[PDB]
CSV table of C-alpha atoms and ligand atoms in Angstrom, one decimal:
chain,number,residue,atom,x,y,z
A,24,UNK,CA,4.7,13.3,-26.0
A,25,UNK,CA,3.8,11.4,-23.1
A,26,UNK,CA,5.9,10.2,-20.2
A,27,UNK,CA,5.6,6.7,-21.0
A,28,UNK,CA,8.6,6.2,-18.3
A,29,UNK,CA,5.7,6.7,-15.8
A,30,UNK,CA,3.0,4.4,-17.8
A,31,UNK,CA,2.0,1.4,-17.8
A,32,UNK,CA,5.0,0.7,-15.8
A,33,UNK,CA,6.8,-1.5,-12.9
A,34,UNK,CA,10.6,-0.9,-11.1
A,35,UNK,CA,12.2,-4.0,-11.4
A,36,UNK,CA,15.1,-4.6,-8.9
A,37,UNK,CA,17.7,-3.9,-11.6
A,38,UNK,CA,15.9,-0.4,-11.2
A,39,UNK,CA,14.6,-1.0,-14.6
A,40,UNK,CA,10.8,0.4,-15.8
A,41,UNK,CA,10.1,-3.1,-17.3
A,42,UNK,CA,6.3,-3.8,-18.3
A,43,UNK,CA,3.6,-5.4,-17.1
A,44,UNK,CA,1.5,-8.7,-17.3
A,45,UNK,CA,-0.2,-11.7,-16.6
A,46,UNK,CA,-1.3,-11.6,-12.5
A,47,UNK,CA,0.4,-13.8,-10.9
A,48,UNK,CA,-0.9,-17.1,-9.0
A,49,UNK,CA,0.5,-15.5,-5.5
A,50,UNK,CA,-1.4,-12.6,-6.0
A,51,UNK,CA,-5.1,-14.3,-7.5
A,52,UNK,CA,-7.1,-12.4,-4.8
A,53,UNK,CA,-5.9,-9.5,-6.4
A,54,UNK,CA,-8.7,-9.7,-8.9
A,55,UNK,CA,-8.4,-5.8,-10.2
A,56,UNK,CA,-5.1,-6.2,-11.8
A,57,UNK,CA,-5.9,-10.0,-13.2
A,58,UNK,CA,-5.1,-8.8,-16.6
A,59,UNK,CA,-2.2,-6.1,-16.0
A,60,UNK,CA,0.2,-6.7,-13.0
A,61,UNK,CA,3.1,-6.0,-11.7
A,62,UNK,CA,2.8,-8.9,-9.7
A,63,UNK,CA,3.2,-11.0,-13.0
A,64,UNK,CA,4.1,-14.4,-14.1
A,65,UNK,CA,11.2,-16.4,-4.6
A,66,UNK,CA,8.3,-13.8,-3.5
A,67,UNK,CA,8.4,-10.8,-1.2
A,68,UNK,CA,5.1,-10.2,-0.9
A,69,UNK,CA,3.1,-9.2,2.1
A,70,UNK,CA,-0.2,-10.9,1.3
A,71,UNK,CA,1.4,-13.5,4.1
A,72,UNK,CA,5.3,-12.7,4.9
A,73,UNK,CA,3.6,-10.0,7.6
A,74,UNK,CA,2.3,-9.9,10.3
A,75,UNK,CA,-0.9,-8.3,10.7
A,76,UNK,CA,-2.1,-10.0,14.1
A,77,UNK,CA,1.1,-8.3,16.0
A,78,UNK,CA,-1.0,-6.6,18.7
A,79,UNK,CA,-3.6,-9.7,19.0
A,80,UNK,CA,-6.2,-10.6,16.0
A,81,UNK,CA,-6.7,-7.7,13.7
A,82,UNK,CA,-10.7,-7.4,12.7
A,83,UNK,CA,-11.9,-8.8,9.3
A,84,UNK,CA,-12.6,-5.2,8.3
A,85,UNK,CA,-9.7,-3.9,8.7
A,86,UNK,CA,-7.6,-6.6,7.1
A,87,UNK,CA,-9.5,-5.8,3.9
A,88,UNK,CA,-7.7,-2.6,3.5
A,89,UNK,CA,-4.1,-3.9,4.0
A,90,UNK,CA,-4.7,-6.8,1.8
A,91,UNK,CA,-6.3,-4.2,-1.3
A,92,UNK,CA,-2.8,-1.8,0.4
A,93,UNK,CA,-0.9,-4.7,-0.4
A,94,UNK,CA,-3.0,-5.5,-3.9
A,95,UNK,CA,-2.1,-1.8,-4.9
A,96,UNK,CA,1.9,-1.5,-4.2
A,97,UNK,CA,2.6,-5.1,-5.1
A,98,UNK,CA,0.6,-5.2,-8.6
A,99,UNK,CA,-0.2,-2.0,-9.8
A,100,UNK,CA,1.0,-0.6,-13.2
A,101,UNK,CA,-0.2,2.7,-12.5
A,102,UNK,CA,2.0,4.4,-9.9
A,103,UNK,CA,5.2,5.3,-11.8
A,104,UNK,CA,4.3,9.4,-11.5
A,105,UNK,CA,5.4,8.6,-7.9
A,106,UNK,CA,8.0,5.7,-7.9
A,107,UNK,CA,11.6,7.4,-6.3
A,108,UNK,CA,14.5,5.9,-7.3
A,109,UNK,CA,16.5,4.3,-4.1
A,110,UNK,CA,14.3,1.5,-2.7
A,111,UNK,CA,16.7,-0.7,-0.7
A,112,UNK,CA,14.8,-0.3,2.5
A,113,UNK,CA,11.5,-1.9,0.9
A,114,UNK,CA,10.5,-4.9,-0.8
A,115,UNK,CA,10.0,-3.5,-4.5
A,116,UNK,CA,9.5,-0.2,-5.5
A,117,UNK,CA,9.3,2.9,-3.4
A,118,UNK,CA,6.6,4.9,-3.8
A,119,UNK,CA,6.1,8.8,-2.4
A,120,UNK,CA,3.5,10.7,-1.7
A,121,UNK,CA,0.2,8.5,-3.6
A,122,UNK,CA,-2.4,11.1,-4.0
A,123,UNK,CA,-4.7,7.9,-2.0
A,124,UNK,CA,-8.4,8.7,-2.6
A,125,UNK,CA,-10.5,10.5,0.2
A,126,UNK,CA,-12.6,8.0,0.8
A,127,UNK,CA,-10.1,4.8,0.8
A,128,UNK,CA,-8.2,6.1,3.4
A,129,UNK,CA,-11.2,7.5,5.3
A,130,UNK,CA,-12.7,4.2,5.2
A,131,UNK,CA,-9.5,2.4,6.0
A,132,UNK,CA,-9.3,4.7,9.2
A,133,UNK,CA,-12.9,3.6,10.1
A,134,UNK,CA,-12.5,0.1,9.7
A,135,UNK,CA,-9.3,-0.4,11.8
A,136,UNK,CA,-10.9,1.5,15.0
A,137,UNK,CA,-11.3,-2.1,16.8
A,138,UNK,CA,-7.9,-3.0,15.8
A,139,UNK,CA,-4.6,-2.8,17.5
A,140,UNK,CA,-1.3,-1.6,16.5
A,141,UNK,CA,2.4,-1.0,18.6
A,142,UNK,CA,3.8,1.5,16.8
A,143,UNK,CA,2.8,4.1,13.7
A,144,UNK,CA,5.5,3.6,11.1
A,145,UNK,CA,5.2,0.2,10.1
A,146,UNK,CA,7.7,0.5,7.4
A,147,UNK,CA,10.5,0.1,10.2
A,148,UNK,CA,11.4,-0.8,13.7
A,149,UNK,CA,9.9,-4.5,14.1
A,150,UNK,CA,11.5,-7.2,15.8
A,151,UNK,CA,12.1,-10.2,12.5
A,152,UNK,CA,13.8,-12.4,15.0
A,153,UNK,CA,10.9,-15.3,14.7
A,154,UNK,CA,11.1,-15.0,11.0
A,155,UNK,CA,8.0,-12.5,10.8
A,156,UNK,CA,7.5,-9.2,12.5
A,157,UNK,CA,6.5,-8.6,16.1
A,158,UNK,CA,6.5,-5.6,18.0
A,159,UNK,CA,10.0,-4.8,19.2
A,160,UNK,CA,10.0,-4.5,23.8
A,161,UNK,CA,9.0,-1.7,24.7
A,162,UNK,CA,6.2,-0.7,21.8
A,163,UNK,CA,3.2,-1.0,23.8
A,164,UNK,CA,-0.1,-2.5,21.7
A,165,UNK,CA,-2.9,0.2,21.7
A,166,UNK,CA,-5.7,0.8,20.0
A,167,UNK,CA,-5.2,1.9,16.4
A,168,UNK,CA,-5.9,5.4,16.8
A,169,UNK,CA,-3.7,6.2,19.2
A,170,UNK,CA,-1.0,5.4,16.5
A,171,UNK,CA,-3.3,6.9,13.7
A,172,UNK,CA,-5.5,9.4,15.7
A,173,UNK,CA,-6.9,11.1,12.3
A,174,UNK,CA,-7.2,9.2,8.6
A,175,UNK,CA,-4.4,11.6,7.4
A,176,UNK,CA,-1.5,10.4,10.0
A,177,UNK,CA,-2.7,6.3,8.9
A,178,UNK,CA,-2.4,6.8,5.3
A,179,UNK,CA,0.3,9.2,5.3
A,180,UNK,CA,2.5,8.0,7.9
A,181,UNK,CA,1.8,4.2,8.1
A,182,UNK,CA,4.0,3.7,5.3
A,183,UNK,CA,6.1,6.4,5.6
A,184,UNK,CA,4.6,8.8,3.2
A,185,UNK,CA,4.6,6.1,0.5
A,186,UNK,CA,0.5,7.9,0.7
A,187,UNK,CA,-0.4,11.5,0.9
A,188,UNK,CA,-4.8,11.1,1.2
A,189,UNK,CA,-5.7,13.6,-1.6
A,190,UNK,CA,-8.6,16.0,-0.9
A,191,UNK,CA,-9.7,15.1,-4.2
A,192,UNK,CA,-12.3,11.4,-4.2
A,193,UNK,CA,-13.3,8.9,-6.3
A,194,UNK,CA,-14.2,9.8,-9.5
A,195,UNK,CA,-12.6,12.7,-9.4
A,196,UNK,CA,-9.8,11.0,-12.1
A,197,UNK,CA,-7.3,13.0,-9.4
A,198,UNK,CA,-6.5,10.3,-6.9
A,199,UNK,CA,-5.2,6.9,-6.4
A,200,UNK,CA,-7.9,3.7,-5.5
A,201,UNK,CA,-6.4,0.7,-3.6
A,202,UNK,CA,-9.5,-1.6,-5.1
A,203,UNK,CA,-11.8,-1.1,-7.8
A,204,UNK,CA,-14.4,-3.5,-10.4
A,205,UNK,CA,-12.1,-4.5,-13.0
A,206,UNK,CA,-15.6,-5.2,-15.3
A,207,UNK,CA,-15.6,-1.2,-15.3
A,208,UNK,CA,-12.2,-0.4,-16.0
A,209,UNK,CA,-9.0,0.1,-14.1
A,210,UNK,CA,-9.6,4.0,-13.2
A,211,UNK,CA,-5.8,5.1,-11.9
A,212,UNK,CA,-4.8,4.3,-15.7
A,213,UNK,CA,-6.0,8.0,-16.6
A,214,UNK,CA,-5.1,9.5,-12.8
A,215,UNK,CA,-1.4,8.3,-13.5
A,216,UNK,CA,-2.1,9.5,-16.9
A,217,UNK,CA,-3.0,13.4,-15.6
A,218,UNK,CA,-0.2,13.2,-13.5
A,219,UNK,CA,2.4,12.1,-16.0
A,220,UNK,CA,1.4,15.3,-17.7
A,221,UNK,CA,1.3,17.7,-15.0
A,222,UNK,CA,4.3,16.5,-12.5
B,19,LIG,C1,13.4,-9.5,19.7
B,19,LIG,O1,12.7,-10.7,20.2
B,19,LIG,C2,13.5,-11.5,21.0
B,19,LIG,C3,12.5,-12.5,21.7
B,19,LIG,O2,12.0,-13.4,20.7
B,19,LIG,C4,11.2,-14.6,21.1
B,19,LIG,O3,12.1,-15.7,21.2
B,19,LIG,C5,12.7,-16.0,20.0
B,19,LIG,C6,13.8,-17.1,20.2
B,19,LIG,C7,11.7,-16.5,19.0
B,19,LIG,O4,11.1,-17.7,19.4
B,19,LIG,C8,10.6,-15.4,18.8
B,19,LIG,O5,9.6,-16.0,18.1
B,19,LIG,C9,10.1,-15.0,20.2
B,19,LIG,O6,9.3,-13.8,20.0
B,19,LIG,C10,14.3,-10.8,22.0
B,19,LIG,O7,15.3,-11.7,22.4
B,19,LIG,C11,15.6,-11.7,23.8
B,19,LIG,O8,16.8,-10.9,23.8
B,19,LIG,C12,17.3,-10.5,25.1
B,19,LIG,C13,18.4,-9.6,24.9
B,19,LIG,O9,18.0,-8.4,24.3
B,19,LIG,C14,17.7,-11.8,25.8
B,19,LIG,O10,18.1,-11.4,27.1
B,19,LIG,C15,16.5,-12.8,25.9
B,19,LIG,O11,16.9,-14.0,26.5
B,19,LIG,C16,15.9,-13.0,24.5
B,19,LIG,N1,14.7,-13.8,24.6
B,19,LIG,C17,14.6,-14.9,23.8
B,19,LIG,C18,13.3,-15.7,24.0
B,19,LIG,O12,15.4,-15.3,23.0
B,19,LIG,C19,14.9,-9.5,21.6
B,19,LIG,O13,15.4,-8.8,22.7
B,19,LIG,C20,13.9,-8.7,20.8
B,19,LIG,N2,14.4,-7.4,20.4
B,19,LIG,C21,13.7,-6.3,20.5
B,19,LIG,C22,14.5,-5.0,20.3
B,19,LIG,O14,12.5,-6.3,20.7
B,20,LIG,C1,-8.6,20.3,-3.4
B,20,LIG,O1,-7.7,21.3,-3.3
B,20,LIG,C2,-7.1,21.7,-4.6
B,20,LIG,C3,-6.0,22.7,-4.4
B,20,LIG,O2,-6.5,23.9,-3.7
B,20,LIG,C4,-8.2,22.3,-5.4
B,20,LIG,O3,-7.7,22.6,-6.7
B,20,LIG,C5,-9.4,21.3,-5.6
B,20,LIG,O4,-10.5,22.0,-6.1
B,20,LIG,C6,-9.8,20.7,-4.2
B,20,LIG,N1,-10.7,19.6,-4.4
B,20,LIG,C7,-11.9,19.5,-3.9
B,20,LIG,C8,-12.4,20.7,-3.1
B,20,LIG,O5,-12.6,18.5,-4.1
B,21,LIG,CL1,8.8,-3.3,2.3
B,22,LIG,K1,-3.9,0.5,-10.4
């Protein structure tokens, strides 16, 4: 029989596996998960409560990734093979070890080259005081690879560990996608499925 604790599933701050739904209006530029969201018909999310621009303007490019980052642990059904069960320190669920796609996070890694950042754990340590975050005195702003000098220490260690890059790509029905064409399918529905089973 299959896990369906760890299907088609969202943490709820009861710390309830509730179901999904309905995207909600917040979260419309999340068009993958339109039809099946955790983010579903106050908020916490960080498609504006953070700060992005904390070591100057961070590039177009790189933005992308953090808003489909944010898209992915905000709205999607299809984690629960790696949802923990204390999460007081973030928002909504906690999340270890995503088996994140090859390519997403080498691609995220690319993309953020011309971008700054003060610090590499961005799950802590920031300075809230103006009611968003800034780097805290004495976290110098640097260019983001000398806080993420390889893809596997941004994806891994941004979040604290909420990713682990799997060596495994696309297609592979092995790893995790932060964006995909919802026209084709959602394609972590049968990678949470395999992991369900094996885990
Ligand atoms: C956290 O940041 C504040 C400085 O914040 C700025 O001023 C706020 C009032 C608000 O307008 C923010 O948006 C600004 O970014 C630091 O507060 C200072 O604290 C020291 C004591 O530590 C005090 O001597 C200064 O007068 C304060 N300055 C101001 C402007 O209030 C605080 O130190 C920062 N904390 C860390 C660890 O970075
Ligand atoms: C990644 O490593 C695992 C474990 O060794 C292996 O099973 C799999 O074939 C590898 N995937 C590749 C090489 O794409
Ligand atoms: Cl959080
Ligand atoms: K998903």
């Amino acid at each position: 029989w299959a896990r369906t604790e760890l299907l088609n599933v969202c943490m709820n701050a009861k710390h309830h596996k509730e179901k999904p739904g309905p995207e909600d209006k917040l979260h419309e530029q999340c068009r993958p998960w339109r039809k099946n969201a955790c983010c579903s018909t106050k908020d916490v999310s960080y498609l504006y409560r953070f700060n992005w621009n904390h070591c100057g303007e961070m590039a177009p490019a790189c933005k992308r990734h953090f808003i489909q980052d944010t898209c992915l642990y905000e709205c999607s059904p299809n984690l629960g093979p790696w949802i923990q069960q204390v999460d007081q320190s973030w928002r909504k669920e906690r999340v270890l070890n995503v088996p994140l796609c090859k390519e997403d996070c080498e691609q995220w890694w690319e993309d953020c080259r011309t971008s700054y950042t003060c610090k590499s754990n961005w799950h802590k340590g920031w300075n809230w005081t103006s009611g968003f975050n800034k780097c805290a005195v004495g976290a110098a702003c640097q260019p983001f690879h000398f806080y993420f000098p390889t893809p596997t220490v941004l994806c891994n260690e941004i979040w604290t560990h909420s990713y682990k890059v799997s060596n495994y790509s696309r297609g592979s029905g092995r790893c995790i996608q932060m964006w995909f064409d919802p026209a084709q399918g959602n394609p972590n529905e049968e990678v949470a499925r395999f992991y369900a089973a094996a885990m």
